[PDB]
Coordinates of N, CA, C and O in Angstrom, one line a residue:
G1 N -13.7 89.8 125.1 CA -14.7 90.7 124.4 C -14.6 92.2 124.9 O -15.3 93.0 124.6
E2 N -13.6 92.4 125.8 CA -13.4 93.8 126.3 C -12.1 94.3 125.8 O -11.9 95.5 126.0
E3 N -11.3 93.5 125.3 CA -10.0 94.0 124.8 C -10.2 94.9 123.5 O -9.8 96.0 123.4
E4 N -10.9 94.3 122.5 CA -11.2 95.0 121.3 C -11.7 96.4 121.6 O -11.3 97.3 120.9
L5 N -12.6 96.5 122.5 CA -13.1 97.9 122.9 C -12.1 98.7 123.5 O -12.1 99.9 123.4
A6 N -11.2 98.1 124.3 CA -10.1 98.9 125.0 C -9.0 99.2 124.0 O -8.4 100.3 124.0
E7 N -8.7 98.3 123.1 CA -7.6 98.6 122.1 C -8.0 99.6 121.1 O -7.3 100.6 120.8
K8 N -9.2 99.5 120.6 CA -9.7 100.5 119.6 C -10.5 101.6 120.4 O -10.3 102.8 120.1
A9 N -11.3 101.3 121.3 CA -12.1 102.3 122.1 C -12.4 103.5 121.2 O -12.1 104.6 121.5
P10 N -13.0 103.3 120.1 CA -13.5 104.4 119.2 C -14.0 105.5 120.0 O -14.1 105.4 121.2
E11 N -14.4 106.6 119.4 CA -14.9 107.8 120.2 C -15.9 107.2 121.2 O -17.1 107.4 121.1
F12 N -15.4 106.5 122.2 CA -16.3 105.9 123.2 C -16.4 106.8 124.5 O -17.5 107.0 125.0
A13 N -15.3 107.3 124.9 CA -15.3 108.2 126.1 C -16.2 109.4 125.8 O -16.9 109.8 126.7
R14 N -16.1 110.0 124.7 CA -16.9 111.2 124.3 C -18.4 110.7 124.1 O -19.3 111.2 124.8
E15 N -18.6 109.8 123.2 CA -20.0 109.4 123.0 C -20.7 109.1 124.4 O -21.8 109.3 124.6
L16 N -19.9 108.5 125.2 CA -20.4 108.1 126.6 C -20.6 109.4 127.4 O -21.4 109.4 128.3
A17 N -20.0 110.5 127.0 CA -20.2 111.7 127.8 C -21.1 112.7 127.0 O -21.3 113.8 127.3
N18 N -21.6 112.2 125.8 CA -22.4 113.1 125.0 C -23.5 112.2 124.4 O -24.2 112.7 123.5

């Protein structure tokens, strides 16, 4: 359940920083 988020990782790094 962590691969899908790592393979796609949609604007996750930014949303996570904004």
